[PDB]
Amino acid sequence: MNRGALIKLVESRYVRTDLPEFRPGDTVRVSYKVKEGNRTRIQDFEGIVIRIRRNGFNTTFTVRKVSYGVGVERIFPLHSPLIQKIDIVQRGRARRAKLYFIRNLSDREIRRKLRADRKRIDQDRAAERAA
Amino acid sequence: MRHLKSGRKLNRHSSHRLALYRNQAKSLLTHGRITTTVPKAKELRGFVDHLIHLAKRGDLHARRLVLRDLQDVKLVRKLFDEIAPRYRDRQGGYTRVLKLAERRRGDGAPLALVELVE
């Protein structure tokens, strides 16, 4: 018995697969389904992915944006069905897998410390090219 | 609770544990066989097998990696020249541990000798 293998199997039926790969420092708008009252709409959270803890299917991430001069840190199950889709608005090239320090920096400082990833951006331009 | 936590402390703090491993490895490559307390040897197995593995890789990067620990030119030379090739075919288990018959008189310590595999 390969216990981790078995966990792989069980999680297999629930793995979401299509979402765009991204790294910390990138900026993303999350199509996240929301159940307000009775209906369930989809609102979007856009900010920096300040963190990605990778635990296979249980891998999760956190997004950070300043709503009304108030930094809202939001966390998402990477394979949640409620995540309708992910949108890479920006390839912020950080230099660490965790980016907690931006919690205490002015927005100008933020943009300065996070520069666009020329490589990955040039790839996405290189990608998004159908037959 | 030492649940699944690997690696002996050996009753030495961090850097002394490390420098112990480095000096032990130095002596071992310098002699092939050495004598040490059993737990030191068992903790010494992986620390040597790893360096020998980097010998089997043999590139410059491995030279500076293993040289981070051995910290010697000539010794790492002998490592990458005689030690690496003789273990060119063996995947892992580059050393052997054997327990000695008599303890140490001075404190009754159980003695065990470490050797590079034939």
Binding site: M1, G4, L6, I7, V10, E11, K33, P77, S80, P81 | -
Partner: protein, 204 residues
């Protein structure tokens, strides 16, 4: 009363109804019965389940004869499900169904000679204001000359865990027939790979 042997393979949450319902995954089956505790023979009702199978060259003659009187391959561990007469000869996860309530019995992780705080949640002592060398002691442990002793069962240091433990009224999140895997909401006692016994809940 339905039950099955099983092993705690690990925990994980999954998504049912937009809920990340955390579950423990449990390799239960297949469990072959080896001896049925009958009242005429044993004074009560139960069966004896082998899980997991054991090396034939690693079994003593007594157990071997015990599987010769039975018909099962030599199997490592053998336990009894009290008050359970399975018609079938090898119980599997099929006896349960997702959404069914169960109670699980396992041995919690042995915490060795547990201190008194970790073992009973005693407050201990302050970290400053002069607390002399007593930051984790239980303080007083009794009374003066009357009665002048220590009552039985006074909470103290000792082995916290490493003991038969049963969490109850768990829910079968999902069964996995092909794998003999079972999904139960909440956490199960014992470490991963530690043997466990899955039983129908006694609640109502």
């Amino acid at each position: 009363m339905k039950g099955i042997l099983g092993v705690k393979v690990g925990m994980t949450r999954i998504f049912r109804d937009d809920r990340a319902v955390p579950v423990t995954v449990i390799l239960a089956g297949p469990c072959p019965v080896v001896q049925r505790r009958t009242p005429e023979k044993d004074g009560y009702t139960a069966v004896q389940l082998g899980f997991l199978p054991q090396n034939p060259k690693r079994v003593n003659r007594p157990l071997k004869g015990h599987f010769a009187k039975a018909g099962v391959e030599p199997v490592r561990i053998l336990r009894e499900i009290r008050d359970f007469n399975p018609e079938g000869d090898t119980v599997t996860v099929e006896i349960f169904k997702p959404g069914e309530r169960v109670d699980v019995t396992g041995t919690s992780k042995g915490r060795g000679f547990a201190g008194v705080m970790k073992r009973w949640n005693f407050a201990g002592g302050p970290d400053s204001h002069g607390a002399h060398k007593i930051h984790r002691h239980p303080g007083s442990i009794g009374n003066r000359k009357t009665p002048g002793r220590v009552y039985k069962g006074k909470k103290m240091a000792g082995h916290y865990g490493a003991e038969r433990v049963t969490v109850m009224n768990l829910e079968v999140v999902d069964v996995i027939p092909e794998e003999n895997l079972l999904l139960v909401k909440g956490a199960v006692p014992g470490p991963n790979g530690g043997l466990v016994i899955v039983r129908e809940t006694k609640k109502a």
